Design a protein around this ligand. Structure first.
Ligand SMILES: *[C@@H]1O[C@H](CO)[C@@H](O[C@@H]2O[C@H](CO)[C@@H](O[C@@H]3O[C@H](CO)[C@@H](O)[C@H](O[C@H]4O[C@H](CO)[C@@H](O)[C@H](O)[C@@H]4O)[C@@H]3O)[C@H](O)[C@H]2NC(C)=O)[C@H](O)[C@H]1NC(C)=O
Ligand SMILES: *[C@@H]1O[C@H](CO)[C@@H](O[C@@H]2O[C@H](CO)[C@@H](O[C@@H]3O[C@H](CO)[C@@H](O)[C@H](O[C@H]4O[C@H](CO)[C@@H](O)[C@H](O)[C@@H]4O)[C@@H]3O)[C@H](O)[C@H]2NC(C)=O)[C@H](O)[C@H]1NC(C)=O
Ligand SMILES: *[C@@H]1O[C@H](CO)[C@@H](O[C@@H]2O[C@H](CO)[C@@H](O[C@@H]3O[C@H](CO)[C@@H](O)[C@H](O[C@H]4O[C@H](CO)[C@@H](O)[C@H](O)[C@@H]4O)[C@@H]3O)[C@H](O)[C@H]2NC(C)=O)[C@H](O)[C@H]1NC(C)=O
Ligand SMILES: *[C@@H]1O[C@H](CO)[C@@H](O[C@@H]2O[C@H](CO)[C@@H](O[C@@H]3O[C@H](CO)[C@@H](O)[C@H](O[C@H]4O[C@H](CO)[C@@H](O)[C@H](O)[C@@H]4O)[C@@H]3O)[C@H](O)[C@H]2NC(C)=O)[C@H](O)[C@H]1NC(C)=O
Ligand SMILES: *[C@@H]1O[C@H](CO)[C@@H](O[C@@H]2O[C@H](CO)[C@@H](O[C@@H]3O[C@H](CO)[C@@H](O)[C@H](O[C@H]4O[C@H](CO)[C@@H](O)[C@H](O)[C@@H]4O)[C@@H]3O)[C@H](O)[C@H]2NC(C)=O)[C@H](O)[C@H]1NC(C)=O
Ligand SMILES: *[C@@H]1O[C@H](CO)[C@@H](O[C@@H]2O[C@H](CO)[C@@H](O[C@@H]3O[C@H](CO)[C@@H](O)[C@H](O[C@H]4O[C@H](CO)[C@@H](O)[C@H](O)[C@@H]4O)[C@@H]3O)[C@H](O)[C@H]2NC(C)=O)[C@H](O)[C@H]1NC(C)=O
Ligand SMILES: *[C@@H]1O[C@H](CO)[C@@H](O[C@@H]2O[C@H](CO)[C@@H](O)[C@H](O)[C@H]2NC(C)=O)[C@H](O)[C@H]1NC(C)=O
Ligand SMILES: *[C@@H]1O[C@H](CO)[C@@H](O[C@@H]2O[C@H](CO)[C@@H](O)[C@H](O)[C@H]2NC(C)=O)[C@H](O)[C@H]1NC(C)=O
Ligand SMILES: *[C@@H]1O[C@H](CO)[C@@H](O[C@@H]2O[C@H](CO)[C@@H](O)[C@H](O)[C@H]2NC(C)=O)[C@H](O)[C@H]1NC(C)=O
Ligand code: NAG
Ligand code: NAG
Ligand code: NAG
Ligand code: NAG
Ligand code: NAG
Ligand code: NAG
Ligand code: NAG
Ligand code: NAG
Ligand code: NAG
Ligand code: NAG
Ligand code: NAG
Ligand code: NAG
Lengths: 173, 317, 173, 317, 173, 317
């Protein structure tokens, strides 16, 4: 949420996108389509797996410890034993609560970041051939068939090819 | 005419709720549980060496209660004591029971070497109706109950040097007879006294005649004590009566061993983490099954669930 | 500060804005005015209250513990009692210092973020009818009376209505 | 002509300084204090049950020093001991005083049931000039000072079984007489001895004749001991002299109770958190008032202030 | 990485820039040059020094403590002493690991942020006289000699001076 | 024609790897080490007052073993005990040795004021072949070995009041003679007994005749005990034999002092942090040199290195 894309200027997610986390929808002469962006998807996924690698399967061996349950009242030394274990448990419980809360804030933010970077990258690619509608969509001011759309998704779109067509359409009356 | 190009992100029909720094409930596309909260209920017999105590405490197997004869010289990573356990030999106590239990548990062996102590002038191998081995009157296998020879009990003064490269652990005791009749009958004189010493240590014990409430019909008691003897050092027993003597020593090691109170059954299965409720998987970093654990275990926390987000915020269509 | 708006390209705050945290100032034909943006204000405030809910009024009950002051010298066991409590106190003191320092960095950043999102949202809304002066202000290249300004603040500004007027003024000589 | 539209943010004339990860001093529009650093100075009498010890320690009220007769059978969440407290009965000590104090404090009741012990052959209810109740010579209300009957003191051998469903807590003692004259006068023989036992435990105590520095003119001492007796178990007192005997038992509970040293006065007010300096509010998560606390309290930290920002950075005009 | 500039739309760093952390490269009529930006460099450096001030040279005095090595087997009380110290050490070791990992994520992000703010500031400065090529470079649509480039770096570039020249070059056929 | 203007950032040819939240290996332009992992090997003699024990334990210097006569009345911030240390006076032990060592270490002084105890009726200044001072038979400098005068040992009953404004620390002992011959020769009667008391405390000790394994040819032992006496309080020694008596008291302070086992040599150098491996610098916040530390020290952690990034990510050309 800190970048403003997911649950901000992108109004909602797409339940019909099942082959990626981020992607593109288009309307042109040839119809209306969808395609996932793998690079931004993998960038988010790699980062989350990085956090998982630091948390899953990383446990520490302990062996002989102290007693933690007692059948008799004994006073002083038993008080200290219980106090040590209760102290320890509150500190770890605090660590666990904080960890999850911080990691979760960061995961939400990094995923919004990936969305934002894709949007920005695409905006720069289109140069003067398109305008930002404010809701994650670009109005493209030239005929842009499926191969042209494909070229924007693959990073091969040559904006000079369409520039004349686009400037004429953009700065019309 | 032109075209429209929309950037966007996925969403799912079944979101889950996680906590964040700024919001206690936000829905994400996916999450994973960080707290392990269940066991199957069985203590896995691998990869740690489990010794099921069954009817015996560690101390009973140490002292050599006859029903614990199966335990002689055994080792363990983890000794499991059962709540149904019970003693069935001569009534006893151990000042600092907890500490002896702990140091044996932690040594992780009951390996016992016999030694020939010069006990001339007294009768060895005393027995009782309260310690039955193979239908006969017997005693603690590792202890040697010394009484008079020809109604006489001279001053014992017995030495045993540790010329070995390891510590020796000696377990011994003092009989507190139940009446005046049971002080004069076995020891032949009014007042016993025991003094176990080394170059660095001395423990002296005064026997104490008197009735205790009967335990398995017996109103007398044995009190158990221990002495560790280092290489180059020497054990010395002065006694004028009432000595429950060692037959030798225990090897005391250092290692990974311990003890755990549990009634979970032992299963044929492999699990690195043992709790008293049973073994638990150790993929998660935290667990709320039990504060008592052994092995490679998740850390105990008070929470029952902690969801880590593994996907973006879920913003449905 | 991490987004660059508060104490960055916005030179300073406005002491005369008392009805909101973020807002708009304008100059047009009808004069010079100010109005708070409630949505971005509430977004920041909700987030800060979220942190407060996690810190204020959330204490844990403890009852019988160990002794922490002593009238006699005793040695070993008293050393352990003092050591346990001193250990505990340093760990909590560390937790408290870190918590405040991290939360404060995040609060400063989230508030700069809210400022930035508002600015970006407004920039997209104006389309080709305005240019960014670089200091948080837009030069709007058409007659924009109080109702027009109002319409930009309320998200109802129709950029097509003024586009011709604006392009003519923008790409003049 | 056109128009200008500026985006902006508020600022305040009175900023405050907070710490961040990257800067120890940055000014924000507003902040809140996270460390509680003051008390009003009074221990609030609600919502916890406070028992003001006044002139009495917990142990004195337990033993039954006459000035503590007001405390019989009372309960508490928190017992408050005062520095002005003092003993005014027979001089005594308690081996492991700290532990008895702790286990009683934690049990949180002085509920006492009397029991009829068969003390035939001795004179009961011994008294002294050092323990004045209602101008008369008296003793500890919960203890029974046993002396000779017709200049004779036979071997006592008294039993009391716990057939109840709770633990019983027995408090008892041994008189250490100040001279040889005070060993022969009350007990009629040269050397006392006490042995309190159960099925699981035994404590034996040898009285010790000799002068101590006088405390309130008395050079003798009583030494206090305790014994807990479980359901199905039995108490047994063998004695040949010097027994300061129980009149019954204390109920020992488990719960939320404890004890605190403080001289703060008790107020008619409601506060969940008590420290020795007084009650403190518990809205903040941390406090630097006292490491000693009771109830729902902020955690003790070394810092005196910790400001959390509750507003944006302040960038004045 | 969270802002998308360093190891994102800027393809790589410049080993030949040794007088600053961030800067400018240009090509014009007078040749090809480089100059460091001191303000953004110092902004990053101040922030990192801030973290260092909180970690370096800030240690706490301890004196008499408990024993931590033992020559004899003793059981209960020795178990508690060892357990307390082992507990303490795992908690500090956890604090140290987390601290470094969080600070390192933040340092990487704040430095990418400084790069991004400089880029954005420069983009706004150029107004309609330049377009973003998508790789950190601006195509400037007018003659821009060394003094003009200097003026963009020093925040004194007057975009109105070149606007006519630039619009004519930009919206050509 | 026009121009091109590129924004960019530096990079270096020699990057280093750091850990982050999302990646265990990312290269940054520069980093700094947060864990101190080395010492020079010497304990710096400043700024803390170091007392090298050399051949002497703290307890030996306390009791006054002749080779420790150089230590009389010394102070320390840190007392350093050496593994080569050894005792060369009368064989002894201390019940709760660890606690006496700790409380003296922590007091941080051996300041001793002599006091004139009224020891009439006995012979003072007993000596032995096992405690050689200046080629002559001697004893512990701070202890006073009391024996019979004219083959008689009356009941000692000696008082010493603390009218000072500080606590007094009294060290004393009991001789356990090796045979019956060494109980009758020096004390003139079959059984000693010692009772050291105050208004708040009493310690009674029964000597115990019998052989221990010989240590430096001696089979007897001394057992050392201590008593702290507050202002307004009084020390009292009843004895009927076997008293190893004090010659006075130690001042017990509170402060910053302690003790450390180390074999590192002492250097002429300045360092705030001492470990047993030597002094270490304290610029870094963490260290993995030793869990045992004294002074202003980095905190001990299990890791050997922790790199903090001090520069941007390194993205080479
Ligand atoms: C929601 O989030 C979680 C966490 O990101 C995610 O669960 C994870 O999914 C992966 C893949 O489904 C799991 O990885 C498996 O781990 C087990 C070991 O425990 C292995 O047996 C698996 O191996 C498979 O693949 C291998 C080839 O690469 C083969 O060797 C083998 O034959 C298997 O086919 C595999 O590595 C991972 O354990 C979970 N993690 C957790 C914590 O659950 C889940 O997929 C996400 N849900 C959605 C809908 O995206
Ligand atoms: C100090 O007091 C205690 C408690 O009173 C006392 O211990 C008790 O001693 C009696 C008598 O010796 C014990 O009684 C026996 O208990 C067993 C087991 O329960 C019974 O089987 C015995 O029955 C036989 O004796 C009966 C009496 O004549 C016969 O009628 C019967 O047919 C059997 O032959 C017998 O009742 C009792 O168990 C203990 N109690 C406890 C709690 O230990 C102790 O003896 C006293 N001390 C001294 C030195 O006198
Ligand atoms: C600077 O920051 C702090 C923290 O954000 C902020 O102080 C908070 O302000 C609110 C409102 O002033 C306080 O909320 C009150 O809490 C008390 C309980 O302790 C209640 O009595 C109050 O109830 C009022 O409103 C209710 C109706 O909604 C009524 O039921 C009632 O009659 C009251 O009128 C109210 O909920 C909050 O406690 C403080 N928090 C702290 C930690 O101080 C402060 O306002 C900020 N300053 C500025 C200038 O913005
Ligand atoms: C071992 O030594 C100790 C210490 O010396 C000793 O204890 C002391 O005993 C004396 C004599 O019995 C006590 O003296 C009494 O103290 C009270 C209270 O302070 C006074 O009121 C008494 O005054 C009366 O006796 C005087 C002497 O004849 C009369 O002149 C006067 O008019 C009164 O009648 C009296 O002084 C003293 O208090 C204790 N001291 C301490 C610290 O306990 C102990 O008796 C010795 N042990 C043995 C077995 O001898
Ligand atoms: C990689 O990162 C590290 C950390 O940012 C960085 O090392 C630091 O560099 C500075 C300057 O080189 C060091 O500062 C010095 O500290 C010592 C005290 O320990 C002082 O003696 C130094 O004083 C100099 O300057 C003073 C005038 O201002 C004079 O008084 C004096 O005569 C000295 O000339 C100076 O303050 C700092 O200690 C290190 N920190 C660490 C943790 O190493 C390193 O430079 C970075 N590498 C690169 C290539 O950028
Ligand atoms: C209880 O048993 C112990 C262990 O046996 C016993 O202690 C031992 O006593 C003997 C005899 O007194 C000691 O032997 C001496 O040791 C010293 C030092 O090593 C030697 O120098 C002595 O040599 C002289 O005596 C020899 C024998 O006649 C001569 O031949 C020689 O020339 C010397 O004059 C002598 O061997 C022995 O050291 C101790 N051992 C230990 C471990 O302490 C103890 O005496 C017994 N207790 C009782 C009360 O009897
Ligand atoms: C594992 O065993 C522990 C210990 O028996 C269980 O914790 C107890 O749960 C009961 C409820 O049945 C409570 O009354 C006790 O207060 C708990 N005892 C202690 C000592 O904490 C726990 O329920 C079990 N956990 C699982 C997952 O099976
Ligand atoms: C609460 O009481 C504590 C304990 O008395 C106070 O801490 C003591 O303060 C004095 C100064 O008057 C110091 O000399 C002592 O070192 C402190 N004692 C201990 C045991 O730490 C504290 O000042 C009081 N706090 C408040 C807020 O009233
Ligand atoms: C500092 O001294 C400690 C303690 O002697 C060293 O830790 C020991 O290292 C040896 C290897 O030589 C291990 O066998 C032991 O397990 C360690 N002992 C303990 C008690 O932990 C350590 O190597 C030294 N450190 C430095 C930096 O010199
Ligand atoms: C773009 O990429 C897809 C596969 O990823 C390919 O099938 C398509 O032909 C490409 N189109 C263009 C115009 O580059
Ligand atoms: C959502 O549904 C699928 C299909 O039943 C399931 O496997 C998946 O785990 C669910 N995801 C979550 C996060 O609940
Ligand atoms: C343990 O004792 C019980 C009850 O006395 C008995 O039924 C069982 O056979 C014993 N089990 C073993 C393994 O000795
Ligand atoms: C004592 O018992 C063992 C084992 O039953 C036996 O071999 C030994 O000879 C006995 N000792 C004596 C002195 O008879
Ligand atoms: C904008 O909103 C305000 C109130 O929030 C309203 O009074 C005003 O008339 C609105 N104007 C337009 C043009 O939408
Ligand atoms: C600033 O001034 C007002 C008015 O006196 C006051 O109530 C408020 O708490 C002050 N804020 C801060 C953050 O000091
Ligand atoms: C407590 O003792 C003091 C001093 O002896 C006395 O003045 C006061 O009346 C007593 N208070 C109570 C409540 O018994
Ligand atoms: C002992 O004291 C109580 C209470 O004063 C009394 O009722 C009881 O009868 C006394 N005991 C005897 C044996 O007189
Ligand atoms: C820009 O700044 C540099 C020094 O920082 C100066 O030498 C140069 O002349 C300046 N040029 C302009 C055009 O402002
Ligand atoms: C890189 O090289 C220089 C020159 O030898 C050296 O001083 C510097 O510390 C190195 N930096 C790193 C981060 O290794
Ligand atoms: C310490 O003792 C050794 C070995 O007995 C001896 O060589 C050395 O001189 C002594 N050192 C001191 C400082 O007394
Ligand atoms: C005991 O020894 C000291 C010091 O050697 C001496 O001055 C003192 O007079 C001796 N005591 C007696 C009673 O001779």
């Amino acid at each position: 949420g800190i970048f403003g894309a997911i649950a901000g200027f992108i109004e909602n997610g797409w339940e019909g996108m099942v082959d990626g986390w981020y992607g593109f929808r288009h309307q042109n002469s040839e119809g209306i389509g969808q395609a996932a962006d793998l690079k931004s998807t993998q960038a988010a996924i790699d980062q989350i797996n990085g956090k998982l690698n630091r948390l899953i399967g990383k446990t520490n061996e302990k062996f002989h410890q102290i007693e933690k349950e007692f059948s008799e009242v004994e006073g002083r030394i038993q008080d200290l034993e219980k106090y040590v274990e209760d102290t320890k448990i509150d500190l770890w419980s605090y660590n666990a609560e904080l960890l999850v809360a911080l990691e979760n804030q960061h995961t939400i933010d990094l995923t919004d970041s990936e969305m934002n970077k894709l949007f920005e990258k695409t905006k720069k690619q289109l140069r003067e051939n398109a305008e930002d509608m404010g809701n994650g969509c670009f109005k493209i001011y030239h005929k842009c068939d499926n191969a042209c759309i494909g070229s924007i998704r693959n990073g091969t779109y040559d904006h000079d090819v369409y520039r004349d067509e686009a400037l004429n359409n953009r700065f019309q009356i | 005419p032109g075209a429209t190009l929309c950037l966007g992100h996925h969403a799912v029909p079944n979101g889950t709720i996680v906590k964040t720094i700024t919001n206690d409930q936000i829905e994400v596309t996916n999450a994973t549980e960080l707290v392990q909260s269940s066991s199957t209920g069985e203590i896995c017999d691998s990869p740690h060496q489990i010794l099921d105590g069954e009817n015996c405490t560690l101390i009973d197997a140490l002292l050599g209660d006859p029903q614990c004869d199966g335990f002689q010289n055994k080792k363990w990573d983890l000794f499991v004591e059962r709540s149904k356990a019970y003693s069935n030999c001569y009534p006893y106590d151990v000042p600092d029971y907890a500490s002896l239990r702990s140091l044996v548990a932690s040594s992780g062996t009951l390996e016992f070497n016999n030694e020939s102590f010069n006990w001339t002038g007294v009768t060895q191998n005393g027995t009782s109706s309260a310690c039955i081995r193979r239908s006969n009157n017997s005693f603690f296998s590792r202890l040697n109950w010394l009484t008079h020879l020809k109604f006489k009990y001279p001053a014992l003064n017995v030495t045993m040097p540790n010329n070995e490269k390891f510590d020796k652990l000696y377990i011994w005791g003092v009989h507190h007879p139940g009446t005046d009749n049971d002080q004069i009958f076995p020891y032949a004189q009014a007042s016993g006294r025991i003094t176990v010493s080394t170059k660095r240590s001395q423990q002296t014990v005064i026997p104490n005649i008197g009735s205790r409430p009967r335990v398995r019909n017996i109103p007398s008691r044995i009190s158990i004590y221990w002495t560790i003897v280092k290489p180059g050092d020497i054990l010395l027993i002065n006694s004028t009566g009432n000595l429950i003597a060692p037959r030798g020593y225990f090897k005391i090691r250092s290692g990974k061993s311990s003890i755990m109170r549990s009634d979970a059954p032992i299963g044929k299965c492999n699990s690195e983490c043992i709790t008293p409720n049973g073994s638990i998987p150790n993929d998660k970093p935290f667990q709320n099954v039990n504060r008592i654990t052994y092995g490679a275990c998740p850390r105990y926390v008070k929470q029952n669930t902690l969801k880590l987000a593994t996907g973006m915020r879920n913003v449905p269509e």
